[PDB]
Design an enzyme around this catalytic site. Structure first.
Site, PDB file in Angstrom:
ATOM      1  N   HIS B  79       4.730  -6.498   1.847  1.00  0.00           N
ATOM      2  CA  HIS B  79       3.698  -6.310   0.836  1.00  0.00           C
ATOM      3  C   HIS B  79       2.613  -5.448   1.458  1.00  0.00           C
ATOM      4  CE1 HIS B  79       5.458  -9.680  -1.375  1.00  0.00           C
ATOM      5  NE2 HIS B  79       5.236 -10.483  -0.345  1.00  0.00           N
TER       6      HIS B  79
HETATM    7  C1  EV1 Z   1      -5.261  -9.192  -0.204  1.00  0.00           C
HETATM    8  O1  EV1 Z   1      -3.993  -9.704   0.112  1.00  0.00           O
HETATM    9  C2  EV1 Z   1      -3.154 -10.028  -0.961  1.00  0.00           C
HETATM   10  C3  EV1 Z   1      -3.684 -10.493  -2.123  1.00  0.00           C
HETATM   11  C4  EV1 Z   1      -2.904 -10.831  -3.175  1.00  0.00           C
HETATM   12  C5  EV1 Z   1      -1.534 -10.717  -3.066  1.00  0.00           C
HETATM   13  C6  EV1 Z   1      -0.656 -11.063  -4.247  1.00  0.00           C
HETATM   14  C7  EV1 Z   1       0.599 -11.831  -3.866  1.00  0.00           C
HETATM   15  N1  EV1 Z   1       1.612 -11.231  -3.255  1.00  0.00           N
HETATM   16  C8  EV1 Z   1       2.655 -12.004  -2.973  1.00  0.00           C
HETATM   17  C9  EV1 Z   1       2.740 -13.352  -3.285  1.00  0.00           C
HETATM   18  C10 EV1 Z   1       1.670 -13.946  -3.929  1.00  0.00           C
HETATM   19  C11 EV1 Z   1       1.633 -15.302  -4.298  1.00  0.00           C
HETATM   20  C12 EV1 Z   1       0.500 -15.805  -4.953  1.00  0.00           C
HETATM   21  O2  EV1 Z   1       0.448 -17.153  -5.331  1.00  0.00           O
HETATM   22  C13 EV1 Z   1       1.318 -17.500  -6.372  1.00  0.00           C
HETATM   23  C14 EV1 Z   1      -0.570 -14.960  -5.223  1.00  0.00           C
HETATM   24  O3  EV1 Z   1      -1.712 -15.444  -5.866  1.00  0.00           O
HETATM   25  C15 EV1 Z   1      -2.867 -14.731  -5.512  1.00  0.00           C
HETATM   26  C16 EV1 Z   1      -0.550 -13.636  -4.865  1.00  0.00           C
HETATM   27  C17 EV1 Z   1       0.572 -13.155  -4.230  1.00  0.00           C
HETATM   28  C18 EV1 Z   1      -0.922 -10.270  -1.883  1.00  0.00           C
HETATM   29  C19 EV1 Z   1      -1.777  -9.928  -0.821  1.00  0.00           C
HETATM   30  O4  EV1 Z   1      -1.166  -9.481   0.356  1.00  0.00           O
HETATM   31  C20 EV1 Z   1       0.233  -9.640   0.272  1.00  0.00           C
END
Ligand code: EV1
Ligand code: EV1
Lengths: 145, 145
Positions: B79
């Protein structure tokens, strides 16, 4: 998720072997002290320590019994916790500090290897942050030449 | 200490390839939603995604733009965050999820590879705990057979 490992890894601008020697033999604002003993190998030279620490983590007073060993060849320090407040949450709690040259200064790795008593136990994020800030502090007091 | 990596590693009682497939395609109590698109390779099959997330971390509403890619051969999801609140603290912020068989179930590793804007920036312990609790939650909803 009962068995796991937390890691903080940081780049430092210092030769690996020099930095390892600094870590091996080294903040007053964090409340702490220890009592204990030094351990020897057989030639009479100190190879490690066994310490009972009294300290305050996130405002709470705690104790821990820690046995430290080192491996100069791999620049590794190992802290093995046998007793204390953390053992209310963990069946096993070990902290491994490694220093290596960047394939390119150095990379310092603090790993907390843990096994929880049960699923209600927390993972040791409080300790990871504490060790991280300690090593960032130490490293900001070290400079070239 | 401007460049570093935080890791949480957990043992799970699940075949590595099966667990990877579960993670690759998968809590409502945490406030979040996303908008965005799927990315394809050339044969018209989805290979990744680009998402704009709206979420609440430790009570605070935030956004992030994330590009996700995967490598089935190594069971790795990546990611890559390009924009959003975290980029006020980090020049670079990538989250790498790996699943491998225990040399002995599986070991799942979430790594946050970061570079701070400056020395006043925090290391991403808040994100490490958030991803850790997410993966512990998911894994406790998976059982044999
Ligand atoms: C700033 O860093 C991030 C913020 C949000 C995310 C979004 C995200 N990616 C993968 C799995 C996730 C799983 C989550 O929980 C269900 C979620 O809620 C915020 C966001 C997720 C990823 C991030 O880095 C991967
Ligand atoms: C429960 O976990 C621990 C608790 C205390 C310690 C004691 C300790 N070992 C190494 C370096 C330390 C560095 C410290 O800060 C100066 C400190 O204050 C509590 C304790 C330290 C180690 C621990 O694991 C290594």
């Amino acid at each position: 998720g009962l068995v796991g490992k937390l890691v903080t890894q940081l780049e430092v601008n210092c030769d690996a072997d020099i930095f390892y020697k600094i870590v091996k033999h080294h903040p007053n604002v964090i409340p702490h002290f220890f009592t204990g003993v030094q351990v020897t190998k057989g030639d009479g030279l100190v190879s490690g320590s066994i310490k009972e620490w009294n300290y305050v983590l996130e405002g709470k007073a705690m104790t821990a019994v820690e046995e430290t060993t080192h491996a100069d060849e791999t620049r590794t320090l190992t802290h093995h916790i046998t007793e204390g407040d953390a053992m209310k949450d963990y069946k096993k709690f070990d902290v491994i500090v490694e220093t290596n040259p960047k394939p390119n200064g150095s990379v310092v790795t603090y790993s907390i290897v843990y096994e929880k008593i049960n699923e209600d136990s927390p993972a040791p994020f409080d300790y990871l942050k504490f060790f991280h800030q300690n090593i960032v502090d130490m490293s900001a007091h070290i400079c070239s030449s």
